[PDB]
Amino acid sequence: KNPKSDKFKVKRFHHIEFWCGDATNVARRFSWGLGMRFSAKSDLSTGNMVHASYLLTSGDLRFLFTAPYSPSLSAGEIKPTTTASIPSFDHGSCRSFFSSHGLGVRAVAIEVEDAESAFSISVANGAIPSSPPIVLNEAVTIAEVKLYGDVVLRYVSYKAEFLPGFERVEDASSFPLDYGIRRLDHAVGNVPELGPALTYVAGFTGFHQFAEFESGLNSAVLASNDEMVLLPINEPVHGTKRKSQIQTYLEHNEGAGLQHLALMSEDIFRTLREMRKRSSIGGFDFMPSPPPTYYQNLKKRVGDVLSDDQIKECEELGILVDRDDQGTLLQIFTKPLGDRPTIFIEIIQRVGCMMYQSGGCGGFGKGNFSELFKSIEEYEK
Amino acid sequence: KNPKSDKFKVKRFHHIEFWCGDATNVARRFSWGLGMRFSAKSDLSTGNMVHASYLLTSGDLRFLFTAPYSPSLSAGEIKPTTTASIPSFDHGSCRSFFSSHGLGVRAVAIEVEDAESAFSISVANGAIPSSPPIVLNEAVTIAEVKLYGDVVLRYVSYKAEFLPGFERVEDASSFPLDYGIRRLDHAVGNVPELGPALTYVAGFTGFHQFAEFESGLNSAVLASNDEMVLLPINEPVHGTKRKSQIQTYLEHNEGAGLQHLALMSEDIFRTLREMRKRSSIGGFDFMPSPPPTYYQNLKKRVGDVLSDDQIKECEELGILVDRDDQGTLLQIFTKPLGDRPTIFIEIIQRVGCMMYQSGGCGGFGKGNFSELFKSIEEYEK
Ligand SMILES: CCCSc1nnc2c(C(=O)Nc3nnnn3C)ccc(C(F)(F)F)n12
Ligand SMILES: CCCSc1nnc2c(C(=O)Nc3nnnn3C)ccc(C(F)(F)F)n12
Ligand SMILES: [Co+2]
Ligand SMILES: [Co+2]
C-alpha cells in the first residue's frame, strides 16, 4: 500500500550533519573508521568566523561535522553580514545541543525540488519551523523544521560545491579512502511516544507508513513517494524483563533524538573486513557477534540466496541476515559512536527487488530480533 | 645557575588531561595519530556515572581524555557518594572550559612525594587553590592549584592502576601501537603578561629559571630541581609586522592556556615517518617544511653531530635542528590539534648531556626562529 501522498517533491537523502565540540577530531576519526574521503570544508581558512564544518563523502553518502568557534570571532557580525556558510547555525543552539546530548545528529537533510515550497507546505501542515528558507548565493536554498527532539529535517534545493562558501579540500589532505559504503539507506529516531511522533511527521510531509514483514521496541517507518527517503521511529516498551534500549537511549540522550544511521554498502563483506581491521586502531567497534547456532540456522532460511561460503563469511564477520517476501537483508551494528550509549551506525546490503533497486528491499531486520533470541537459547545447550 | 629551590619534592611529569566534549573520538584519533595504546578507562562500564575518561600511553607518556555525561545520571549523588574517579571533576567547569576554549589541556599533572604537602606549601606561597587534596582508596592523593588561565597544575602522590577506579582495558581493544614516543619533555603556556605569570608560578613552586642559549614572542622556562619538569611560558610582542601567534592564540582560546606539548621520541625519524604516513588518514598534520636552503645551511652548524645522510633524512621529514653549548635538539611541530589555532604538539629528540640525559639538553629551539627567517630570505634568491 503506497498512496504516494508526499505534499511536496522529495528526491534523496542529501547529507547528515553532526553537531560536535571539535569537528576536526570527530571528522578524522569517522573518515578512518568508515573509509570516507575529506571532500569540502568551511572554516577559518575559508573566511567562516562562526563555525568549522568538514564534509566526508563515500559514494553518495555525505557526513558533515560542525562545531562553533568562540562567539568573539564574529561578535561584530549581524545576520545580514554573517560569515557562516550555514545560516541556520547558532552558537547557543549548538553548545546547548552538545552539552545536552553529546555527539549526535543535528540535521537529517533531504534534497527537494523547492526548499521554500517544502518549508511553507510543511509549516502549513503542522511542522514546527526551525530556520526559515534562505537562498545562498542565488544557487541553493536551505530551510529547517523540527523533526523530533532537537533534530531537524533540513530541506535543500538547487536551482541548477556542496554548499556555497564551502571549498574543495586540497588533494594532499584528501586521501581516497573507500571501504564500499555508498549511500544513506535510512535514519532512525527514538522518541518517548511513537503515536504523536508519527502523526506529527506524517502530518507535515505526507510520508506514508512503509509496510513491514518482547524486545522492548515498537516502531514504524515513514517513507516518501518512491520510498527512497526512509525515516523509522522507535518507542520503548516498558515493563519488560530486560530494560528497553530505547529507554536507555532516552535517558542518556536527555530525550528524543536520532538513534542510528543505516549506510548501504555495495559489498558488505569488503566493508566489514575493512572496518573491523581498524576497530582497535581508531575506527569503530561492532556489537558482539551472534552465537554459531544463528549461522547454523541460516541455511534453513536463506540457503536459496547465499552460498555455504557466503554464509560462512557471515559468521566470521558477525553479519546478521533477514528476509522479506520481496528481498533479503544483510546487516550489522556498531557499538555507540561516542561516549554515550545513544547513536550508532548500521551497515547494510539489500539483495532483490530489481525493477534499479526499490527502497526497503528486505525490510529492516525486525525478524532478526526473534531469531537473536532463538539463537542464544538454542546455543546455550 | 640552579639554586635547586623546589619548595617540595617533585618527581616527573605524570599525565596530561584533555577536557573534551566526546572523549571517545578524541582519544581514538590521538591513539592512531601518535601511536599510543589504550591503557585504562573510567566510564559507565566501570561504574563512573559522572565522566568518561580514557588513558592513552606511549612509553612513559600518559594522555587522559575526559568528557562529562549528562548530569542527570548522577543527580542523586553527593560528593561523599560520588562515582567519579577524578573527584576534582565538575560538570559545569568542564562544560564551561570546553565551550570557552574548545579542545585543550585542563591539567598538567606532576608526580610528587606528598600531594597534600605540595598543595599546602603551594597555597601558603600564593597558589590559587583549585581542588583540595583528596585521598583515593587510601592509595593515591590528588590535589590541584591554578597554573594559568583555566589550566591547573595537578599534584599526584602514591603511598606505594593509573588511578583507583580505573580499569585495565581488554587486550582486544588494546592494540600495541608505538611510533617511538616515550615521555613528556615540556608543557608550554601562553599568557598575556609573562612577568606576573612567572612571578606567580615560581612563587608557589620554587621552580627556577632555566638558562637559555622580531618573532613576536617573549618566553622563559621554569624548572624543577633536576630540571626534568619544564614549564615554559610565552607572552606576545605587539607592534610587529606579522601578528604575534601568541596573540592569535589568546584571541581564539579566549585567554591564557596551554600552547604546546613537547613529546620526546627515542627515534624522531621513525616517529615522523609513522605520523606522516597517517596525516591524511586520521592522524596529525605538520607545519610546512622549511625551504631547502635551511638544510643547505645545516652542515655548517651541526655537521659534527649528524651525518650527511641524517641531514638529508631531516630534509625529507621537515625536521628542524638547533643546538645549545651543551647539546643538540631535533624538533618539528604539528598543525593545531583541533578546530582552533591554539594547542599543537612538538616532537623532539635531544642528543648530548649524558652524565642518563640531563634535562633541557640542547635548549628549546629558540635559535630556529632566526634560522627560519634566514632560511626563507636566502631561499627566495
Ligand atoms: C545495537 C544493538 C541493538 S539491536 C538492533 N537495533 N536496531 C536493530 C534493527 C533495525 O535496524 N530496526 C529498524 N531499522 N529501521 N527501522 N527499524 C525498526 C534490526 C535488527 C536488530 C538486532 F537484530 F540486532 F536486534 N537491531
Ligand atoms: C607552530 C608554528 C610556530 S613556530 C614555533 N612555535 N614554538 C616553537 C619553539 C619552541 O618550542 N619554543 C619553546 N619551547 N619551550 N619554550 N619555548 C620558548 C622552537 C622553534 C619554533 C620554530 F622554529 F618553528 F619557529 N617554534
Ligand atoms: Co535499521
Ligand atoms: Co617547545
Curated annotation (Swiss-Prot), chains A, B:
One of its GO terms (molecular function) is identical protein binding. Its EC number is 1.13.11.27. GO terms for biological process: L-phenylalanine catabolic process; tyrosine catabolic process. Residues 12-158, 183-335 form the VOC domain. Its main location: cytoplasm. CDD domains: HPPD_C_like, HPPD_N_like. The keyword Transcription does not apply. Belongs to the 4HPPD family. This is 4-hydroxyphenylpyruvate dioxygenase. It comes from Arabidopsis thaliana. The lineage of its organism: Eukaryota, Viridiplantae, Streptophyta, Embryophyta, Tracheophyta. The gene is HPD.
